[PDB]
Design a protein around this ligand. Sequence first.
Ligand code: CA
Ligand code: CL
Length: 279
Amino acid sequence: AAQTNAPWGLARISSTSPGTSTYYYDESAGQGSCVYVIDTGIEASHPEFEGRAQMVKTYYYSSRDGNGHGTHCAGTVGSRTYGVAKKTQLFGVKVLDDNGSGQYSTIIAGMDFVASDKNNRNCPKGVVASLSLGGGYSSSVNSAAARLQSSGVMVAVAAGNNNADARNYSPASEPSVCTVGASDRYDRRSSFSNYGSVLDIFGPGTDILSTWIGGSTRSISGTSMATPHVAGLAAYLMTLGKTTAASACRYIADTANKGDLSNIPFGTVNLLAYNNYQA
Ligand SMILES: [Ca+2]
Ligand SMILES: [Cl-]
């Protein structure tokens, strides 16, 4: 399949070179997989989700995404126009308030929730969790992310946006999950992206167009935007049978575009998520 005039990041993950405009992908499109978006919620009614999104848990007064962030990230995972895995099932877990903030105890509880809830969902191609969130180092947060991964969920987490070593951020610094840095459309490390030995992969994160609340769309930037590219790529690759929840991060690193990014500090991977699609 090919999507012409795609958001740059979608085109990027299906090209060995920057600057293209068509997103090439197998039409299975993540069908049969499920991705939990652990965030501010998801506006499931957005036409771009086509009935494939639903809220399954909230830690606030409403399940409504009153911010937009969670809807944006969900859209990069799996919306029709803006998503990597256009036929996946999306599940929203609202651990962040409508200002985009959340307490660690709440974020932990939402991870544990997914580890259990997935046992009551039909996800025959597997389960992914996208965590476009985090703050400073916390062993308890890292342990929660490790638990979610061990339970059989492909965990993708944001590296953080401090132009600093991700070793001092959580859940970014948990080794056993997939820690995602951000790049721009010219294959530079995004100006804000964290780096370091714990990063597994880069994805597009500067000026990413996706869904927003109110049935809208907008472009924003962050390692929060890179993360759902990787989560969606994992779902896509799991539906194709190429990898599993346990092995998907490693598979994505194995198959990544290598040494194409600039301003990567020595000791950080120079690896850009790539679907290696061959019509
Ligand atoms: Ca890792
Ligand atoms: Cl709910």
